[PDB]
Design a protein around this ligand. Structure first.
Ligand SMILES: COC(=O)CN(C)C(=O)c1cccc(O)c1
Lengths: 237, 300
């Protein structure tokens, strides 16, 4: 069944599961042809496959060559996503394979279902939550590795850095979704908050800055303010 | 012309024969149905006046034996039976025919409806879908479920239609996932037509039988099966030209024969809107599209 606010804590139990987001798989800049018509030029994309309990991120980079000479790319993108997620599962040891895959957009259900026919016991679930994973390309190190790729490539990250040494998965996921919601609603402001003062750094092996617990509270507050603001600036409230 | 005689009619019942029907009163002197066209399967069916629950009936072919009906007061229904004494049956039939205690199968000469609804339906294929090999005829009723419905409970009383499932390994070639899901031609032509049904006539026979069980008994699983068999053809980019033309004729007469007051339950919006207006064959069903639009434009 569908994943929502009611069953939100199921994300952090001990059954292995993955979120799959396909927003950033097929990415285009739309431009004008010399004849004044409109054309798209693809740029590199990525599948965002995330274990919400552990933070392990399987970032499958989607190189623009995969679209060469293909038609109906937005439809292909969903099937390519499902082919790549199925290949990732088959690559994992049995004891690491997920018991559920939650897709962030319902149009991935039938593509993923058909590719996972060999895995009748892996449940493919939609969700009622409006998760901000599209904003993953606002994380500088993820964007950088996608755009630099010259061939198809899988890159592994922990999207929680070292947070789980100090906080629970539930709290880590909440922080992640707050950060990404903020980058999605006003990327410029969000990045200013993060990269604020010159005594705070990002470790070479991390994605986010090395905030103390107290600074994270301050940061998280600032991100909440931004999100409500933009919600006023948008709606005039 | 052949005859399906009755010992008596002890309970008030509406009796159907193919697309015809008449009301028989409790203990009215009814003794059967005569002038039944040879060469086609037929279905005699029943709806009791007191319990409109359970429409039930019998598929039969007068070429395969002499069949007669006696009400069973223990099991509470009109049963079909097979007489083995050919002279008893003929003396009995003739006797009743002289007392004019039979209704005449009321076929208008111009009328090809029944032929067109049963063109590809054979008793031999019915008896494989409805397994009861000690009888030449086949019982079907409102409540019987299909093999496929059971997989998702009494196997002896099941409709063994061919299982169709668009998200299944049988339907999707490893490595052609997207290709086969968006264009079912592989599954139609290789798996089902070449592999399972052997030819399109047998495919059309099962499609027509499923429709008729949906129409005459309100059998839900049969309606599911009819729509699935239509959708598999409509969602295939590559269909023999002869099948497409005949499918149009088939569906035309099915929609033409459907009671106007039943389109709400027996017609699946999504299948028909996909089939007539989006699928590969959206433009290959002119006669069916025409009568669907002049007769059920609400559904669409
Ligand atoms: C009427 O008393 C009888 O003993 C005979 N009846 C009518 C039958 O059972 C019967 C009816 C029809 C066909 C048949 O082959 C037999």
């Amino acid at each position: 069944g569908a994943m929502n606010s009611s069953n939100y804590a199921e994300l952090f139990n001990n059954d292995i599961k993955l979120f799959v987001d396909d927003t950033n798989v097929y990415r285009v800049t739309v431009h004008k042809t010399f004849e004044g018509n409109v054309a798209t030029k693809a740029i590199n994309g990525c599948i965002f496959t995330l274990n919400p309990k552990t933070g392990h991120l399987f970032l499958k980079i989607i190189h623009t060559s995969v679209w060469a000479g293909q038609k109906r790319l937005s439809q292909l993108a969903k099937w390519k996503t499902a082919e790549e997620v199925s290949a990732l599962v088959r690559s994992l040891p049995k004891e690491e394979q997920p018991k559920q895959i939650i897709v962030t957009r319902k149009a991935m259900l039938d593509p993923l279902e058909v590719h996972m026919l060999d895995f009748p016991n892996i449940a493919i679930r939609p969700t009622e939550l409006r998760l901000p994973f599209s904003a993953a390309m606002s994380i500088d190190k993820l964007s950088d590795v996608v755009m630099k790729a010259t061939e198809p490539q899988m890159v592994l990250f922990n999207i929680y850095d070292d947070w789980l040494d100090r906080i629970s998965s539930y709290t880590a996921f909440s922080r992640l979704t707050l950060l990404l919601r903020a980058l999605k609603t006003n990327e410029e402001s969000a990045k200013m908050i993060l990269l604020s003062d010159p005594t705070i750094t990002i470790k070479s092996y991390h994605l986010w800055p090395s905030f103390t617990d107290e600074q994270w509270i301050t940061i998280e507050s600032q991100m909440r303010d931004l999100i409500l603001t933009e919600y006023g600036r948008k709606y005039n409230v | 012309m052949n005859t399906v005689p009755f010992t008596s009619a002890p309970i008030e019942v509406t009796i159907g024969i193919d697309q015809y029907s008449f009301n028989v009163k409790e203990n009215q002197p009814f003794h059967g149905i005569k002038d039944i066209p040879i060469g086609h399967v037929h279905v005699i069916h029943f709806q009791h006046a007191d319990n409109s629950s359970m429409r039930y009936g019998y598929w039969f072919d007068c070429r395969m034996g002499n069949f007669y009906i006696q009400y069973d007061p223990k099991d509470g229904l009109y049963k079909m039976m097979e007489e083995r004494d050919g002279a008893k049956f003929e003396n009995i039939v003739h006797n009743f025919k002289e007392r004019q205690m039979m209704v005449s199968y009321p076929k208008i000469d111009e009328d090809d409806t029944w032929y067109n609804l049963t063109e590809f339906v054979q008793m031999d294929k019915i008896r494989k879908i409805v397994r009861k090999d000690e009888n030449q005829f086949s019982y079907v009723d409102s409540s019987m479920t299909t093999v496929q419905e059971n997989e998702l409970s009494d196997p002896a009383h099941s409709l063994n239609y061919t299982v169709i499932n668009f998200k299944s390994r049988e339907a999707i070639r490893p490595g052609h996932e997207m290709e086969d899901f968006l264009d079912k031609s592989y599954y139609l032509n290789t798996v089902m037509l070449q592999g399972i049904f052997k030819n399109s006539s047998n495919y059309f026979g099962e499609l027509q039988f499923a429709f008729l069980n949906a129409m005459f008994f309100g059998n839900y699983g049969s309606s599911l099966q009819w729509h699935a068999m239509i959708e598999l053809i409509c969602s295939s980019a590559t269909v023999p030209k002869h099948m497409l033309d005949k499918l149009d004729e088939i569906l035309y007469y099915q929609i033409k024969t459907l009671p106007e007051q039943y389109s709400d339950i027996l017609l699946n919006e999504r299948v028909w809107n996909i089939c007539l207006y989006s699928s590969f064959q959206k433009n290959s069903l002119h006669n069916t599209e025409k009568i669907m639009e002049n007769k059920y434009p609400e559904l669409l």
